[PDB]
Amino acid sequence: VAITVQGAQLIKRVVERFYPGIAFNINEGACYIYKFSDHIRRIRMKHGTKYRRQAEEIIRNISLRKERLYGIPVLDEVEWKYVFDGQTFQSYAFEVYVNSILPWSELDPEEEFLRNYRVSREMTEVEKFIEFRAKNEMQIYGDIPIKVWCCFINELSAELKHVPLGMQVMADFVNRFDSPFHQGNRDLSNLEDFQVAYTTPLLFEMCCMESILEFNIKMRMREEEISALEFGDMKVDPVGLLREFFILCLPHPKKINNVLRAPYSWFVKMWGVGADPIVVLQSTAGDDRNSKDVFYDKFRTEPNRYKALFRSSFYNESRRMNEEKILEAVKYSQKLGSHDRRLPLFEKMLKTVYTTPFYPHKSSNMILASFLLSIQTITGYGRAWVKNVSTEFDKQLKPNPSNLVQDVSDLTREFFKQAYVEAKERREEIVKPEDLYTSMLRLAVFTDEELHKKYNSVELYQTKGSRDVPIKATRTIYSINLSVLVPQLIVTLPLNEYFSRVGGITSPDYKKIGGKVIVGDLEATGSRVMDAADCFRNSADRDIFTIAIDYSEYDTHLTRHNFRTGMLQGIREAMAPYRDLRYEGYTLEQIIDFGYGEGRVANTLWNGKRRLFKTTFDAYIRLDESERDKGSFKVPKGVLPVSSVDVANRIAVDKGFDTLIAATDGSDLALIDTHLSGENSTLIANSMHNMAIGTLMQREVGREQPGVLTFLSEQYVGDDTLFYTKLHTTDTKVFDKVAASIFDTVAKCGHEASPSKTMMTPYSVEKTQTHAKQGCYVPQDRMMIISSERRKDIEDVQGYVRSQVQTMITKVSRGFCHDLAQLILMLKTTFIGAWKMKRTIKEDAMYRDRKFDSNDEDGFTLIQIRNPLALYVPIGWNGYGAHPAALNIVMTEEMYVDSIMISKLDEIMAPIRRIVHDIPPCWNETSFFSKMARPAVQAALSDPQIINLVEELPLGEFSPGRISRTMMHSALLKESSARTLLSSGYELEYQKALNSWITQVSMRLGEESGVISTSYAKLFDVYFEGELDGAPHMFPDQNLSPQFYIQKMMIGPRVSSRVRNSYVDRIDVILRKDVVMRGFITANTILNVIEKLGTNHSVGDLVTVFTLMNIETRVAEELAEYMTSEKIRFDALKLLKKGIAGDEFTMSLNVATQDFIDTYLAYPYQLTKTEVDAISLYCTQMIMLRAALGLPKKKMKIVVTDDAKKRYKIRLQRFRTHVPKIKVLKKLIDPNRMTVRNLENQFV
């Protein structure tokens, strides 16, 4: 019944189907075979050295399998005809697919490429262009080949006795068509064949996702022990909601899903808002509307105050635009596919969306609301051709008295001026001429002629870039030349650091400007449920009416000059207190228009993908005889080149459209005057543009309809506004006039905010893709498991799947099934390093690198199939660990000796016990600067060489610096060659480090002297005693598996800040701020320098020791006081090694905080500050395992008896982890510390 016994039979059966002649034993750590293909056999034929048997050996091992080398069997990969056992179905979706195909008739500039038919022996001017696009657009790179994904569902559908539709349309693709593509399993980036259609990998990636989405639901529906979902009155089947959706996209899935995701997201926002009894989850927090310290009460219901408000004309107009958006996506697919049926289950819900209720306390309404958010992720990573279009500023709106353009431009001048003043109070100033060159390392140049040169030329220019996104179409990224970005670095620096803090008060009548705007970081620091608690409590409040407008194509109306001049007017007038000092000869007012000049951002030439027209061939050669030029600009491989646009537009249209065309030089590609995403002021400026617009929003509402709609909060983030207001009348006519004056303010600014995008609702909040509904948490999961952003190279396979399980902690936290999230990792633990070995071996002997023989030079590489239960063997024993009973608990080596002593885990961890100390090891790979360096570095580099070299060869730790500059020089050649060149070196290392591997007995629970881990708690016993309250805590995030619902029930959501971040990580906060310190060195780096010397003779010998790290000099103050603090304050000198409590579900719980100790911990008082953390980090995993089993909630107490022999073993083992014997003569630390002097008298 356990996941380790039932699930391991399935992943073994996948290997029993994939490599069909493999005898697999579970109790072996990893079995080894090999296989080869003749793509490399043909190559050394061409160099002269012919081979003995060309394909005779291939005949020997196809189906007889009778040959095996060195005793190691040789087994072939399965063909495509057999991955579904030759099954066939009716599959009405598949016959919709095959009539929705079209050859040689597509528009060559288009966003998401349609169904092109592959006909063999066709032309090399169209079909090579279509093969050029699909090689860039349709790529399924990642960590797992897509072939074994299709075999995995074939094995998984049999056990659940349920057939997914993604396999039904795939099983008809195997009997009529042989092989869709040839993905090489070594690199996963090459797809060199399409047999019937160019969009065949998109056909599978939307099918290998379609199958998991209904295995996720059907497993979850039995966990809630309900038959089907329940819209507010009627029964509804969730799989029919997806099968009605999968048929509609299947003509053109990247285009259909991008226009159908808008009514699906809008439906979940406005569901339970119009019903008269409304059930909320009563919350309580601070007086500010943005306070995050929230306390939850039980569920209750209340009468709706806004019942008659939804009879208005704002919602009735907004609903028919969304019912149109359903119908336009339908009519585009009713003709391109043969189907006459569409969406019959969803259309019955949108006709009455407001008045139907939604109750979160029943699970049959929370799964359905989560499912519709997770519908849209089948066609992940929309990769799209973009075209190069210009400014076209005749459409740019000129400032007028009748328009608000000049009033917007004078508002935003007073906001950059105000951000500079309020950064002066937080000690954020401009950079100085002294540290101008030192402060240039914040990015990864400066010449008086290179700074005066322009870029509005065909000869020299700027070059665009592009990077992908999860569901959206591919957004651009701007690459600016580094000569003219440093003038933007010097003047936008006290704005990047100022809005970097997380705290803020958002009141409109407050005078300050920093709290009301906020720019987050790359990763969400903390959880998502934890730091979005201000969104939850305002959907649970009867008197908050939130307004959140949306700007469609924000840059096209940021293109206007009104925010360009008004920003630069406020830059110049605020540099007036800095008007005397000169930057390298010239003033500061001259250099701001070197980063915001005319040939910098006003009018610059940009080169993207080119314009191109589809024409005939006979008229092409009659004109191309005069203009055959190249060399100025390049042309894609399908297209035929000409010189200019003016000879390319005269022959433009053709009924046959045989051959393509492209202008190389005479194009005049693109000129843009718009705030770039690449500048240092991207997220600072456009969020201030929402502030200048949003302040004009409150004025016209207050001047046309006064007394109504008072404003209480103002949150401005990237391309979003969020007003927390309250409405003072439930009127049908008056509210219709207030909602009209909001759109008239945006339209008279220049933008066009859609009435279907604008949100004016009482009981629903969306903010930065976090949906809050009626006091609870409705989650989406757009993160996916098949595709990826770029091709991923598995360099640290110990640390890759340890990082991949973090993105599987989040998935089950949004409602994915817990055990289905175990089966995915147990599949994904065997198929990672299978093709990372160079040459073949013979077992129980040496490992052959060179062969020089015709037999073994055919069997090139090996296969390494690890056991599926390598997920559960803990770290430090050459395999990564996650616990089977709960995914959020880190399996460590002290947890392995505990989890076998518990009676409720003798059945689950019975097959785990036989594979420990059985697994193979892990593929664990590991001039200008004379100006841009601190004077700690320049004095150390301009030294006499007789003094500079003694810090390099004999002595010195020196983890950052000139050799790290060489590592920074190794980081810039890293991307192609240095990753590949050392990959030839680690493989010769890994064969020796595998042949010298002996599976060693006598596991140890301990660490070195100068560090300690969570395994320190095994010195003492632990007695589960006491009794606590069995009160079920209340929490907003419903929709969890029972392995996660019971951890949040017994242990509530946290209410304070966690204390377990030790003072070793308090100085990491000092090293987190500096980006010249953040990406390079940290606490494990800086404590090794304290390991080289403690207890010096003067503090003036103390401040200077980290200038010898040659990074900074200011933060040696924080290392002056804290070492003086640890000379005053007690400390255990050791560090803390851990890998636990970092995933975003553990940060939400009330574990590892100061209020967690006071009820769940009882420890002896003779323990230091970093020893009580090692007990508490042990104590967190014990209680989370105590709750996820069903064991009774007790108070964990570590006990020290009076057994005078056992009191001696503790005083012997606490001593050696505090002070080292031999290393005292290395550090020359004094033993007269107060903490280490107590150890004589602690336990006695």
Partner: peptide, 20 residues
Amino acid sequence: SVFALQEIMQKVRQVQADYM
């Protein structure tokens, strides 16, 4: 077949019904 414990899955309806 369910891999979750039936002792856990019965404690949940003892508080899923207390909401109702």
